[PDB]
Design a binder for this molecule. Structure first.
Ligand SMILES: O/N=C1\NC[C@@H](O[C@@H]2OC[C@@H](O)[C@H](O)[C@H]2O)[C@H](O)[C@H]1O
Length: 312
């Protein structure tokens, strides 16, 4: 294979990236997006703040751009994310009780309906759990509606889009731990009670030299519950600046992650949260950390590239 697109295509899996539609006007960015991936997800364009800035007022221009890019280039389209405690407009946070539930339900219905037939899978609910186990403690959805909001969102999504693969997404759940266990229980419960749920997304925002040794094992147990699994926001951050041994360790980590997916029949593929370190979200969120993607700031392939190629 000459591109990661071919490598993934050959493995019968997806290799995607998080797209910022505005960067499509940047030649080198587009060249890589066009040639190295077979799947695309909106890094921000389809979130609540970007789609419903004011209650009942939707703005799909940005999300449409991402969707159009996918159809135009023949790539699968993944949707991120319908219900999430972050990047939630104040107007929504200002609602309570029935008013809030109705706003959530309508947001799911409107967005899912708008992209119906285009988005193949949705991160319906994102980051519902807490590190250490249990439900997230700073979520407007958890605080205003309690435990049942997740099921409500999934049922609402399925009603709006009868065929889309509906996933629940989270981070720090790549290995077996208290958090992934809480997620495992939810997934099992939903399948047992017939709640619409087809997949689980393992964000995989990892630290280099720290890939869980039980990654595949964890992916397999979720797959065994009767759902598909997918690595949705892969990036492995290191302490900056980068150097040779850090880049090599990172390359090794990327190989380990793609391998775990390859070892699970139901792992749909791997999506990296961005193309180049030039735009990666890590530095501004994790002080002193970065250089987490496959391409550096000059659009030069890093060692991680060959590792991903070999893994597929
Ligand atoms: O870990 N969980 C997530 N991580 C990255 C999130 O995407 C970021 O959201 C904030 C924006 O300012 C950034 O541009 C964007 O990369 C993702 O939505 C979430 O699931």
């Amino acid at each position: 294979a000459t591109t990661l697109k071919e490598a993934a295509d050959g493995a019968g899996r997806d290799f995607g990236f998080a797209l910022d539609p505005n960067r499509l006007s940047e030649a080198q960015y587009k060249a890589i997006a066009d040639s190295e991936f077979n799947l695309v997800v909106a890094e921000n364009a389809m979130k609540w703040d970007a789609t419903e800035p004011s209650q009942n007022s939707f703005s799909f221009g940005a999300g449409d751009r991402v969707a159009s890019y996918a159809a135009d280039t023949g790539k699968e389209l993944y949707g991120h994310t319908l219900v999430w405690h972050s990047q939630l407009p104040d107007w929504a946070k200002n609602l309570n009780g029935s008013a809030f539930e109705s706003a959530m339900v309508n947001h799911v219905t409107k967005v899912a309906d708008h992209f119906e037939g285009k988005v193949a899978s949705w991160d319906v609910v994102n980051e519902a759990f807490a590190d250490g186990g249990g439900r997230r403690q700073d979520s407007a959805f958890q605080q205003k509606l309690g435990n049942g909001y997740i099921e409500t969102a999934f049922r609402a999504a399925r009603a709006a889009d009868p065929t889309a693969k509906l996933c629940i997404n989270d981070y720090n759940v790549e290995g077996i731990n208290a958090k992934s266990n809480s997620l495992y229980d939810l997934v099992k419960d939903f399948k047992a009670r017939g709640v619409p749920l087809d997949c689980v997304g393992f964000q995989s925002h990892l630290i280099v030299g720290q890939v869980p040794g039980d990654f595949r094992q964890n992916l397999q147990r979720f797959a065994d519950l009767g759902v598909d699994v997918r690595i949705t926001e892969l990036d492995i951050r290191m302490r900056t600046p980068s150097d040779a041994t850090k880049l090599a360790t990172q390359a090794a980590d990327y190989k380990k992650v793609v391998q775990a997916c390859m070892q699970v029949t139901r792992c749909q593929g791997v999506t990296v949260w961005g193309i180049t370190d030039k735009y990666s979200w890590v530095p501004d969120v994790f002080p002193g950390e970065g250089a987490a993607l496959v391409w550096d700031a000059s659009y030069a392939k890093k060692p991680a590239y060959a590792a991903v190629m070999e893994a597929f």
